[PDB]
Design an enzyme around this catalytic site. Structure first.
Site, PDB file in Angstrom:
ATOM      1  CG  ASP A  53      23.406 -20.415  32.890  1.00  0.00           C
ATOM      2  OD1 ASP A  53      22.851 -20.830  31.840  1.00  0.00           O
ATOM      3  OD2 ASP A  53      23.509 -19.210  33.187  1.00  0.00           O
ATOM      4  CG  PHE A  54      28.011 -19.806  28.313  1.00  0.00           C
ATOM      5  CD1 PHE A  54      29.350 -20.170  28.426  1.00  0.00           C
ATOM      6  CD2 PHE A  54      27.659 -18.867  27.348  1.00  0.00           C
ATOM      7  CE1 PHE A  54      30.330 -19.605  27.565  1.00  0.00           C
ATOM      8  CE2 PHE A  54      28.615 -18.302  26.497  1.00  0.00           C
ATOM      9  CZ  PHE A  54      29.955 -18.676  26.605  1.00  0.00           C
ATOM     10  CG  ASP A  55      24.457 -16.789  27.664  1.00  0.00           C
ATOM     11  OD1 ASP A  55      23.761 -17.696  27.152  1.00  0.00           O
ATOM     12  OD2 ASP A  55      25.371 -16.223  27.060  1.00  0.00           O
TER      13      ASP A  55
ATOM     14  N   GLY B 250      21.477 -22.681  27.329  1.00  0.00           N
ATOM     15  CA  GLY B 250      20.387 -22.464  26.397  1.00  0.00           C
ATOM     16  C   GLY B 250      20.845 -21.529  25.285  1.00  0.00           C
TER      17      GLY B 250
ATOM     18  CE  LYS C 264      20.480 -24.192  30.981  1.00  0.00           C
ATOM     19  NZ  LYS C 264      21.308 -23.110  31.612  1.00  0.00           N
TER      20      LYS C 264
ATOM     21  CG  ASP D 197      20.260 -21.731  35.040  1.00  0.00           C
ATOM     22  OD1 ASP D 197      20.576 -22.450  34.070  1.00  0.00           O
ATOM     23  OD2 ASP D 197      20.655 -20.552  35.162  1.00  0.00           O
TER      24      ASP D 197
END
Ligand code: ALF
Ligand SMILES: [Mg+2]
Length: 209
Positions: free
Chosen positions: A9-11, A98, A142, A169
Site C-alpha cells: 500500500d502507499f500512504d 487509493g 485492491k 487494504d
C-alpha cells in the site's frame, strides 16, 4: 524459480505520509481532512465516499501547491533496502493505492517498482476541480488488482504477499498468500497473518520466502 509478487500500500506504508493530508495542508484544511482520513483507515467510513469528500475540500487548489505537498512525501525507513532484497529474492514489486498517480508514480519511478496503481485527481486550468476518478475506489478494488497483476505474471496467489496499514487494504489481504499488517490499524491487524509494529520495512524480510 517460481515467480513471486509483493504488493505494498502507499500512504503510511511505502511512504511516511498520507498524501491527501499533505495536500490538504496546502489548501488550509489539514485538520478536517486528517480526521476523515483516520476514520476511513479505521474502517468507519466507506472508502470511495470518504475519498470524494476529502477531495472536494481541495477544490480550486493550484497544481503548484499540490506539487509542493508531494515534494514532502518521503519513503518509509528501510524502503529502498527492502525493495532491493525483494528483487534479489525473485519478487515482482508493486504498489497499489487509493491515493493518487501524481504522487504514486513519482515513487514508482524513484524506487523502480514493477507496477503502480492509483486513483487520479482531476485538474483543469492548473487547479484541482474537486473531483477524483479511478479504479482503486471500490471496497474490492485492491484485491482485484492483486489478482490482475498475478495473472499477467503467471504467479499463483499462494505466492503473493500484501503489506498494508488501513481498512482499504482488507480486500488486498483477502486474495494474498501472506498478509502483513505494517504499524496498522486494528481493523486490518485482525485480518493479518503477521503484524509488524516497528516502523522499518526491513522488518518484513524475515518472513519472506
Ligand atoms: F496508499 Al493507501 F490506503 F494508504 F491506498
Ligand atoms: Mg495506507
Amino acid at each position: 524459480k517460481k515467480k513471486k509478487l509483493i504488493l505494498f500500500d502507499f500512504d503510511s506504508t511505502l511512504v511516511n505520509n498520507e498524501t491527501i493530508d499533505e495536500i490538504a495542508r496546502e489548501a488550509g484544511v489539514e485538520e478536517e481532512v486528517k480526521k476523515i482520513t483516520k476514520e476511513a483507515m479505521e474502517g468507519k467510513l466507506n472508502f470511495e465516499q470518504s475519498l470524494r469528500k476529502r477531495v472536494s475540500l481541495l477544490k480550486d487548489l493550484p497544481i503548484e501547491k499540490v506539487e509542493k505537498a508531494i515534494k514532502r512525501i518521503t519513503p518509509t525507513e528501510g524502503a529502498e533496502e527492502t525493495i532491493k532484497e525483494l528483487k534479489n529474492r525473485g519478487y515482482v514489486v508493486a504498489v497499489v493505492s487509493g491515493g493518487f498517480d501524481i504522487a504514486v508514480n513519482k515513487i514508482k519511478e524513484k524506487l523502480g517498482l514493477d507496477y503502480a496503481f492509483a486513483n487520479r485527481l482531476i485538474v483543469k486550468d492548473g487547479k484541482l476541480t474537486g473531483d477524483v476518478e479511478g479504479e482503486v475506489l471500490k471496497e474490492n478494488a485492491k484485491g482485484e488488482i492483486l489478482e490482475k497483476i498475478a495473472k499477467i505474471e503467471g504467479i499463483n496467489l499462494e505466492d503473493t504477499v500484501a503489506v498494508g496499514d488501513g481498512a482499504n487494504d482488507i480486500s488486498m489481504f483477502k486474495k494474498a498468500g501472506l498478509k502483513i499488517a505494517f504499524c496498522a490499524k486494528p481493523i486490518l491487524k485482525e485480518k493479518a497473518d503477521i503484524c509488524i509494529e516497528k516502523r522499518d520495512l526491513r522488518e518484513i524480510l524475515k518472513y519472506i520466502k
